[PDB]
Nucleic acid binder design. Structure first.
Ligand SMILES: C=C1NC(=O)[C@@H](CC)NC(=O)CNC(=O)[C@H](Cc2c[nH]c3cccc(OC)c23)NC(=O)[C@H](Cc2c[nH]c3ccccc23)NC(=O)c2csc(n2)[C@@H](C)NC(=O)CN(C)C1=O
Ligand SMILES: Nc1nc2c(ncn2[C@@H]2O[C@H](COP(=O)(O)OP(=O)(O)O)[C@@H](O)[C@H]2O)c(=O)[nH]1
Ligand SMILES: [Mg+2]
Ligand SMILES: [Mg+2]
Ligand SMILES: [Mg+2]
Ligand SMILES: [Mg+2]
Ligand SMILES: [Mg+2]
Ligand SMILES: [Mg+2]
Ligand SMILES: [Mg+2]
Ligand SMILES: [Mg+2]
Ligand SMILES: [Mg+2]
Ligand SMILES: [Mg+2]
Ligand SMILES: [Mg+2]
Ligand SMILES: [Mg+2]
Ligand SMILES: [Mg+2]
Ligand SMILES: [Mg+2]
Ligand SMILES: [Mg+2]
Ligand SMILES: [Mg+2]
Ligand SMILES: [Mg+2]
Ligand SMILES: [Mg+2]
Ligand SMILES: [Mg+2]
Ligand SMILES: [Mg+2]
Ligand SMILES: [Mg+2]
Ligand SMILES: [Mg+2]
Ligand SMILES: [Mg+2]
Ligand SMILES: [Mg+2]
Ligand SMILES: [Mg+2]
Lengths: 205, 675, 86
RNA sequence: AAAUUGAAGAGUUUGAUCAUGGCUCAGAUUGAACGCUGGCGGCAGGCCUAACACAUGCAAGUCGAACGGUAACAGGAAGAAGCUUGCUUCUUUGCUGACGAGUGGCGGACGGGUGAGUAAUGUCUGGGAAACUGCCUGAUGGAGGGGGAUAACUACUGGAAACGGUAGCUAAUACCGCAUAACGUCGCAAGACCAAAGAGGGGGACCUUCGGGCCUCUUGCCAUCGGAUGUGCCCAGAUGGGAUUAGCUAGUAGGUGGGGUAACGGCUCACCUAGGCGACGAUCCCUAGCUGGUCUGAGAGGAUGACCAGCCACACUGGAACUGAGACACGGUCCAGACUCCUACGGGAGGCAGCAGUGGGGAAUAUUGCACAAUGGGCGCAAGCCUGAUGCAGCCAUGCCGCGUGUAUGAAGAAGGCCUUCGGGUUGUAAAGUACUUUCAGCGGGGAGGAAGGGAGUAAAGUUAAUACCUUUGCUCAUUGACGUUACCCGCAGAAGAAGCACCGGCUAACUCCGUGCCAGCAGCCGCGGUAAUACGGAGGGUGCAAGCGUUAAUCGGAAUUACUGGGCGUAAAGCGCACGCAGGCGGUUUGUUAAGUCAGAUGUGAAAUCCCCGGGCUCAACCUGGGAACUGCAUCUGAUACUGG
């Protein structure tokens, strides 16, 4: 129910940095981005309309580490909610604990976030949770366990948090390794390289 | 929970004897004895003994089928049961079947004790049988007891070791076990026998020999212990006597089993491969702590209790609801309503302690010869050899409708008995079946019409033939032409035909492209070959697959526009026709080498029968235990040979068949098949 | 009967059946007396027969043999036929 | 404030095109099955076939506070004491607790199962009149006084068993008279007639028939009028297909009169009349339990009725009645029939479509489990007993849901594999190595919630005559958990126990090499294979999904391809050869009236669950749950009169 194979094959297939690696090194030096994985990764064949829609969907799923069944439930939830389906779907994907832990920087990537959340090392409002896809309500407080406070990996990710651009809606206190969820993003803070419109008509065939 | 089982006290015994030797009769009495004492179907029973001094031992009794066709059934019980009580008829003495059954047990090193029976029948002498046993089985049998009286005069038996001419009451079979003085006329014989028993017991223990040398009158208990030691070591064949019909001697052999015949703990532990990949000999000891291990056998059925599966617990203690991996099938199944049988009635049991035999209701994957090991797949157990079938007859469903039922029925039969095996004939699609014995096939068909309600007539298996040319026929001409309106196809061919020696070509056919030059464009060479091949399979003389035929194409003609692969293919077939006719072929029968082992005294009988079946012998082997003969008896002629062979060898012979070579059929036989 | 209480109820039902049949015929025969008097046409005989049976139907209706509606309707249309006679 | 904010196309007829038209595909779904593979937990589901046959165990008992009574256990005591440092009171008694069997009361008509029958005598929707109703509830009054019998029991006797028979004795809230007779029944009145039962707790004075009466509390009984609940009956509409089924009907349709039913009624009989149904489909034939709902669809609609809830019908087959408030009765009776079993051969016994299970059938569906602790039911004053309902556990990836199978670092990119224009590329930061982490599994310990109540004591109040008994309210104490070694929490050790399936010619995401050579084979459609096959088989690479993945079956969709929404008929399929004409469908124009259609308002219904919206609780989720919306369908009442109809 997870991905265990090579990480940068995913970043290669959609041809862009997917943040799967910690970013301590340059992704270009670590791997050749402009080539697709496999023996034919030299060739770039003409991709059809269905192909580009599928690549967009698979790109979002591999950024957030979510499988297809989970992701289809998010889309149905997004379509049921009032508003607009595209940014509603993105909003749920943000409220997952993996993303919020990762974005606040206690984990270098979602995989550290996954270990941290799933190894009972994350508390929300002081309650221990180990479910990766637990939605985060606004005004909820996520903090590190006192046992987990003395581990090297968590403090290591705090520096990389600064190394990248800080999220405006998450307020962090690395002095005691805590963070606050003020409210959800509005799709204006998120990266524009994700075309959420293609997602709607992929699942609405 | 607690085992609550008197370990070592319980014994496992098997009754084996020649056909009509009284085995079933005495077993019935045995059950009566143990039942009143408290107050190959598995029958457990707590036997305390005739004098009941011994704490009630849980004796398990599993009679065996005397008939030769059911050797496997006897074999199954023999391995499963550590001790075996042989039965020998007083008047008949040792008989072929008894000799036969003894050797398999020797192979398994299973300790044995024998009980002479039918003493009441006029014309019987226990001492004569003892002599017969030692000569036939080559094993010294110390007489545990000496029969007093014969036929009508026969009144009882005097224990040799204990020196008491026990005389059971006429009123009831076993109420009184009173011990009396040896009859005056018998004491003299009893005396010599007692000394003989004392020396024999002494050598077995060796220490006892030292006291015997000094002349000390060895205490009866000490010598008795030495006797059991040798029994575990499996040398002395202890023998007791009595008449089951007269209700005398059955109880005596039961007590002997308790105090001499070894217990499951006594018998050496089983072995096997811990893992399938490597031999890994582990020799799991008979311990409840050791992971549970058992072997399934004699799967059966009950219309209201379901399938019945018999398992021998060697080590461990399985409990209800415990998944159990079948090593041979590599899959695990859960034990449900484990049930044991107390003969008179069936009693449910949640779990079975080690050393006891019960039944597992509803165990679908449990079948004959299944290693029911623990889920962790511990050491698998050795697998019991299975003898091949000797007689094979073709059974045909009475109606096409029956076919469906017929196939399913035979399949289930194979499960209960591995030896019984069925298969469909590749040609003529005949349901040829084979069984361990003629009587076995008879019983199979009988129960098929009853339990499965399927009537099927039995007829001899039909034989397939080759049919091949004899003399080389060269320069055969075959021309094909289809010159007609639209599109004509022409393709002429000229080939030669020469018989191939069987050894020369394994395939039996050849197609050298001798064609000097491009006499054929080359695109039609495969086509020509294909045409012959179809004809090769379809025998012109009598529809049989021609073998040992050598043809090489050398000349051919074609029409510039009408040249067609199909034309040459058909033309090739044409050439085959004329060539085959002029070569006057001869049908070939499956002459097969046959090796027959038989007793020396019956060598002549065997030779005559082999010769009679148009089989020319090629060798004689003078093996110590009988002569080994070899012959290429025609398969078509050899049908029912197993049954015929037994009568000429007093049911003491066997044969292994292996196809040798297809040879020319004699004029009469060949013509019969042609017509 | 496989249930112990089922056997008991069988026995009591037979006993109550016999008792009820006797009582029901005993009542029913009195209605027959008055009906026969009606077709005989003697009003005095009919009234005598009627006031013999009148407590009987009411007693049976009260004790549980029949319904008080059944007792009422029997006695109701009997008086109707008596009054039509005279 | 929120309560559907909802519709996609592609391949294939041709040398090419347009159209028509079928076939196929992309989606969702399932009580699924099979193949390959498989770690965990949560919740749910699990014989669709043979309404086929059934071994065995259990599934409906309870009441001593109705009665006789003592078979059984314990208590109690007359007495030689069965006995001796009296350990013990072994012959006796209902005297006590309590209770086998028996009479009696209630329950057994509930709960549980199955879908054979049933096209409407059932179901759904909305009404209605001629009814009954145990237990529960409100009120008004009675509850007086007698009789005979019968089990059980005792004796005798028959039988293998099932089980009886003969005679004698004994009760009762068992049964039966007499008294009583009103707001009850009949009648119009006058009048006539109809019932009942005692038992238990406690006690002051008195009287003793030294048994008790007696006094009060509770509970039970009888009558009548109500309430509620349940059921019986009636009507209209709706609820499948076939005209290659056109006539059907003789208690048939109606009336009078008698009988019958709790009640109306040809319900039944006698007589009288000749009617009744039917083209708006009677009759006959096939199929079928109906609904809320479920699946799909943008909607209309199409399919469907497994789980959950309502109703109906059945209980081996056919029929019948009895008891009862209620049955024509799953674990009751009687008869007949098919089948099976026991036997001493004289006769008897049985009914898993209850739970579990076996055989059989089948592609296919589970344990011969635990506990009444919770909720519910039956009995009982309660305590308690019973409960295969139910609560749980076991088995199965059968669904949905969640998690894990690690985490960073890591190079000229090791080895090997593969391609190679021999230069290199690719697997691939992937691995190894470095550091880190311990979720779930395992081992050890700790430990919620489902628990409300019931029991003993005491205080207070009622209450009487009262301090008594009994009830109501607190207070003190000792206890009540199948699941359960519970969820959950903590400690431990180590990456250690955990990834497979399908596909890669186009439709459709993803390409090369080797084998093979129209062969082997593949294939949903077009089709591929006869020496460079991206289509077969293998291998590297990739893609999709993931503890699952595929295939098959089945439903809807796409299919506007039965077109009501929403299609066509000159030539693609399709205008009767033509006309007349009954039923039917439709109808010019003006005024009046009616208010049937139509429209508006209101009222009552449209069960709950489900679907949808806003919330709440399992750590999330599935799941559970509060409210709302919805169910705009039916019926009634009031109103409007433009259009349709009269
Ligand atoms: C070579 C051939 N392949 C086989 O026979 C395949 C078919 C499964 N079985 C075997 O090789 C193995 N044995 C089997 O499995 C069975 C059982 C068996 C196992 N070992 C045995 C030893 C002794 C007797 C046995 O049996 C009691 C057996 N026993 C048969 O089958 C028999 C005998 C036989 C024919 N051959 C054999 C080669 C070796 C051993 C036995 C044979 N059969 C006919 O009596 C018969 C008469 S006519 C006819 N069959 C038709 C079918 N045509 C032919 O025989 C022509 N032909 C040459 C072959 O068929
Ligand atoms: N006279 C006599 N006959 C015996 C005795 N034991 C067995 N038999 C007979 O032997 C016959 C077969 O006995 P059985 O047990 O069935 O032997 P099985 O056929 O091998 O199983 C029976 O008819 C018995 O009457 C015996 O001790 N004396
Ligand atoms: Mg999942
Ligand atoms: Mg036998
Ligand atoms: Mg003989
Ligand atoms: Mg069924
Ligand atoms: Mg039905
Ligand atoms: Mg009474
Ligand atoms: Mg009176
Ligand atoms: Mg009275
Ligand atoms: Mg009438
Ligand atoms: Mg049906
Ligand atoms: Mg549509
Ligand atoms: Mg009645
Ligand atoms: Mg019943
Ligand atoms: Mg039943
Ligand atoms: Mg069942
Ligand atoms: Mg089957
Ligand atoms: Mg019971
Ligand atoms: Mg449609
Ligand atoms: Mg059209
Ligand atoms: Mg035409
Ligand atoms: Mg036309
Ligand atoms: Mg025309
Ligand atoms: Mg008009
Ligand atoms: Mg109107
Ligand atoms: Mg509703």
């Amino acid at each position: 129910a997870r991905y265990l194979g090579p990480k940068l094959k995913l970043s290669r297939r959609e041809g862009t940095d997917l943040f799967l690696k910690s970013g301590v090194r340059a992704i270009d030096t670590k791997c050749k981005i402009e080539q697709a994985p496999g023996q034919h990764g030299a060739r770039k064949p003409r991709l059809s309309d269905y192909g580009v829609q599928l690549r967009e969907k698979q790109k979002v799923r591999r950024i957030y580490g979510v499988l297809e069944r989970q992701f289809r439930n998010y889309y149905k939830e997004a379509a049921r909610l009032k508003g607009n389906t595209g940014e509603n779907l993105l909003a749920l994907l943000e409220g997952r604990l993996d993303n919020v832990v990762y974005r606040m920087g206690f984990g270098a990537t979602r995989a550290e976030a996954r270990q941290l959340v799933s190894h009972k090392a994350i508390m929300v409002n002081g309650r221990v949770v180990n479910i990766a896809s637990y939605q985060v309500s606004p005004n909820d407080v996520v903090s590190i366990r006192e046992k987990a406070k003395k581990q090297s990996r968590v403090k290591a990710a705090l520096e990389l948090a600064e190394q990248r651009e800080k999220p405006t809606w998450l307020e962090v206190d690395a002095g005691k390794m805590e963070g606050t969820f003020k409210r959800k993003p509005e799709r204006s803070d998120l990266s524009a390289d994700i075309n959420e419109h293609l997602i709607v008509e992929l699942y609405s065939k | 929970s607690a085992r609550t089982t008197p370990i070592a006290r319980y014994r496992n015994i098997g009754i084996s004897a020649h056909i009509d030797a009284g085995k079933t009769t005495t077993t019935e009495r045995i059950l009566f004895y143990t039942g009143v004492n408290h107050k190959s179907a598995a029958t457990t029973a707590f036997w305390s003994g005739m004098a009941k001094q011994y704490e009630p031992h849980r004796i398990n009794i599993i009679d065996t089928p005397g008939h030769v066709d059911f050797t496997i059934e006897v074999e199954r019980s023999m391995r499963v049961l550590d001790g075996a009580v042989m039965v020998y008829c007083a008047v008949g003495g040792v008989q072929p079947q008894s000799e036969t059954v003894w050797r398999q047990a020797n192979k398994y090193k299973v300790p044995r004790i024998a009980f002479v029976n039918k003493m009441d029948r006029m014309g019987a002498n226990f001492l004569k049988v003892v002599n017969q046993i030692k000569t036939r089985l080559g094993a010294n049998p110390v007489p545990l007891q000496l029969a007093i009286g014969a036929e009508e005069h026969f009144t009882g038996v005097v224990d040799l070791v204990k020196m008491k001419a026990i005389n059971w009451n006429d009123a009831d079979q076993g109420v009184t076990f009173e011990y009396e003085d040896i009859p005056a006329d018998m004491v003299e014989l009893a005396n010599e026998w007692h000394q003989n028993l004392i020396e024999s017991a002494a050598e077995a223990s060796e220490e006892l020999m030292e006291k015997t040398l000094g002349g000390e009158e060895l205490t009866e208990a000490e010598i008795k212990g030495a006797l059991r030691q040798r029994v575990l070591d499996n040398e002395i064949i202890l023998v007791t006597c009595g008449s089951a019909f007269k209700n005398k001697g059955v109880q005596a052999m039961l007590d002997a089993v308790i105090d001499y015949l070894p217990s499951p703990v006594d018998v050496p532990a089983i072995n096997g491969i811990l893992d399938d990949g490597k031999d890994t000999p582990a020799e799991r000891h008979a311990s409840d702590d050791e992971p549970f291990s058992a072997l399934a056998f004699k799967i059966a059925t009950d219309p209201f209790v379901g399938n019945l599966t018999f398992f021998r617990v060697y080590s461990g203690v399985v409990n209800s609801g415990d998944t159990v991996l079948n090593s041979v099938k590599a899959a695990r199944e859960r034990f449900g309503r484990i049930v044991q049988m107390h003969a008179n009635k069936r009693e449910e049991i949640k779990e079975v302690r080690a050393g006891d035999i019960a039944a597992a209701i509803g165990l679908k994957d449990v079948t004959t010869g299944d290693t029911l090991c623990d889920p962790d797949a511990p050491i698998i157990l050795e697998r019991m050899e299975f003898p091949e079938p000797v007689i094979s007859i073709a059974v045909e469903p009475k109606t096409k409708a029956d076919q469906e039922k017929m196939g399913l029925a035979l399949g289930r039969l194979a499960k209960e008995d591995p030896s019984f095996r069925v298969w469909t004939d590749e040609e003529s699609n005949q349901t040829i079946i084979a069984g361990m014995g003629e009587l076995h096939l008879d019983i199979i068909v009988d129960r098929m019409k009853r339990e499965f309600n399927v009537e099927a007539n039995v007829g001899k298996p039909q034989v397939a033939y080759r049919e091949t040319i004899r003399q080389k026929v060269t320069d055969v001409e075959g021309k094909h032409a289809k010159q007609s309106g639209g599109r004509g196809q022409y393709g002429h061919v000229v080939i030669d035909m020469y018989p191939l020696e069987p050894g020369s070509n394994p395939k039996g056919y050849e197609f050298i492209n001798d064609i000097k030059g491009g006499v054929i464009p080359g695109e039609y060479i495969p086509a020509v070959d294909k045409g012959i091949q179809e004809q090769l399979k379809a025998g012109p003389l009598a529809g049989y697959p021609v073998v040992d035929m050598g043809i090489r194409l050398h000349f051919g003609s074609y029409h510039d526009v009408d040249s067609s692969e199909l034309a040459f293919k058909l033309a090739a077939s044409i050439a085959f026709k004329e060539g085959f006719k002029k070569a006057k072929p001869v049908l070939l029968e499956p002459i097969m080498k046959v090796e027959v082992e038989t007793p020396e005294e019956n060598t002549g009988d065997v030779i005559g029968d082999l010769s009679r079946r148009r089989g020319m012998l090629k060798g004689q082997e003078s093996e110590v235990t009988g002569v080994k003969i070899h012959a290429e008896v025609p398969l078509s002629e050899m049908f029912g040979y197993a049954t015929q062979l037994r009568s000429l060898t007093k049911g003491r012979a066997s044969y292994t068949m292996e196809f040798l070579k297809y040879d020319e059929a004699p004029s009469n036989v060949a013509q019969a098949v042609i017509e | 009967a496989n249930i112990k209480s089922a056997k008991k109820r069988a026995i009591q039902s037979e006993k109550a059946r016999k008792h009820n049949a006797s009582r029901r015929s005993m009542m029913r025969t009195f209605i027959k007396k008055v009906y026969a008097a009606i077709e005989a046409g003697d009003k005095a005989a009919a009234q005598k027969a009627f006031n013999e049976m009148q407590p009987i139907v009411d007693r049976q209706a009260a004790k549980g043999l029949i319904h008080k509606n059944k007792a009422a309707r029997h006695k109701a249309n009997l008086t109707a036929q008596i009054n039509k006679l005279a």
